[PDB]
Amino acid sequence: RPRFSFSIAAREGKARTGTIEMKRGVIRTPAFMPVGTAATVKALKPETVRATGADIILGNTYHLMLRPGAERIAKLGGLHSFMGWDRPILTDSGGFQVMTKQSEEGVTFKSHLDGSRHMLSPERSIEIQHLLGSDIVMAFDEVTPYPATPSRAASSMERSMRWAKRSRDAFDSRKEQAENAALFGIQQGSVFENLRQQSADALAEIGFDGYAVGGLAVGEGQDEMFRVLDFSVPMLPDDKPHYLMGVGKPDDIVGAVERGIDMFDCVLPTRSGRNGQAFTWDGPINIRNARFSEDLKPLDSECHCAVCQKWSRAYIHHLIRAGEILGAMLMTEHNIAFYQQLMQKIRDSISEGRFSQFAQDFRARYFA
């Protein structure tokens, strides 16, 4: 397999479906990436993560660099070997989570576990992601808060572009990394069309394997998010993957794919699972609700996952109310499987030229 190859098999309007080929495997797109925080997708073995249909997972740099430490993970063989996931892993750059003394060089911060002091910069972030053995490396950026004034948004986007060039040069400086991994750049510019355009132009001039739309996971509401994607995604190179960071709910995903996004990650299916929220085609339910205490149906009556083949809402209700680990295990497996099934339906419908219809049908039912 090549280091990185993105091929588009089918389109419908702005939506695309295709594959990214990398040394560790193929990623079907649009793709949803379960999040491993601290070298585990919470409450699942990697084989279970794979069984749900996931082709790639995300690792959080910030948490890994504090515990167990990047150098330690490298000494033990790299993140894949450490956690037992042998397919591609995308790592974030760590910047969002650090968001403290900031400067053009980078940021220094105190560990929220320890009070220990650490530093992150484009160069150190790229180095950490190398030590982890990440297949898709994210450039280090500066987070713009929402809302941001035009001047702050411009200053921060400009700094991010300077840091994107530093990230590119650090990545390219390291032979093993440049030959085996991919590097994605992140577009900033908040809600402002002109800044999004300057950011897209700067990133394309530098040149990346894929392009993320940053600065949207951050409180703006779905209508505004969709409005920003409307003009922002067409600014990115069409022939490379487009990744919307930190999104999101099933309806967010469907709308974002309609706007040309190919890759997603979110902690919702994992986190929501442990707290009692299960995704269904008829919308999310909270399994702790008393109405489920004697409900013998599965979490979702169309879902193909092993949880829905084997256990009832009533049993999972009991487990979650009782605080049992198996409750978290089953809810998380189901929610990740549901997300994978959603992406598969999205991929098939685009391939078949019926994605618009699928989106309309999906929304009608999910919100009924």
Residue 45 contact, options Zn ion, ligand GUN, its own copies, none, Cβ 5-8 Å cut-off depending on partner type: its own copies
Q: What residues pair up with 22 in beta bridges, in sequence order?
A: 4, 25
- Contact call for residue 321 and its own copies (CB under 8 A): yes
CA dihedral 78, 83, 89, 95 (to 10 degrees): -80
Q: How far is the CB of 194 from ligand GUN (least distance, A)?
A: 18
Q: Which does 101 bind (CB under 5 to 8 A by kind): ligand GUN, its own copies, Zn ion, none?
A: none
Cβ(75)–Cβ(363) under 8 Å? no
As a whole number of angstroms, the longest Cα–Cα distance in the chain is 60
Per rule CB under 6 A, count of chain residues that contact ligand GUN: 13
Query: Which residue, among 142, 97, 160, 135, has the nearest Cα to 3 in the 3D structure?
Result: 135
Q: For residues 26-45, which are near its own copies according to CB under 8 A?
A: 38-40, 42-45
SS3 category, 158:
helix
Does the annotation count 92 as an active-site position? yes
Residue sitting closest to ligand GUN (CB): 214
At 17, which helix (H) or strand (E)? strand 15-22
CA distances from 308 to 28, 52, 64, 190, 315 (A): 24, 12, 33, 41, 11
Distance (Å, whole) CA 248 – CA 254:
10
Out of 55, 92, 127, 258, the residue judged to bind ligand GUN by CB under 6 A: 92
Map the footprint of ligand GUN across residues 108-127, applying CB under 6 A.
none
Tokens of 211: 């392009």
Specify the DSSP class assigned to residue 95.
H
Residue 79 touches which of ligand GUN, Zn ion, its own copies, none (Cβ within 5-8 Å per kind): none
Site map 139..158 versus ligand GUN, x via CB under 6 A: --x-x---------------
* Contact partner at residue 50 from its own copies, Zn ion, ligand GUN, none, CB < 5 to 8 Å by partner kind: none
Q: How big is the chain by its Cα radius of gyration, in Å?
A: 20
**What does 161-198 look like in DSSP terms, one character per residue?**
HHHHHHHHHHHHH-HHHHHH-EEEEEE--TT-HHHHHH
Catalytic residue, from 92, 135, 252, 262: name it: 92
Q: Which stretch binds ligand GUN (CB under 6 A): 18-26, 105-113, 211-219, 314-322?
A: 211-219
Active site residues: 92, 265
What is the contact surface with ligand GUN in residues (CB under 6 A)?
92-93, 95-96, 138, 141, 143, 186, 214-215, 217, 245-246
Where on the chain is the footprint of its own copies (CB under 8 A)?
38-40, 42-45, 67-68, 72, 75-77, 82-84, 293-294, 296, 310-312, 314-315, 318-319, 321-322, 324-326, 328-329
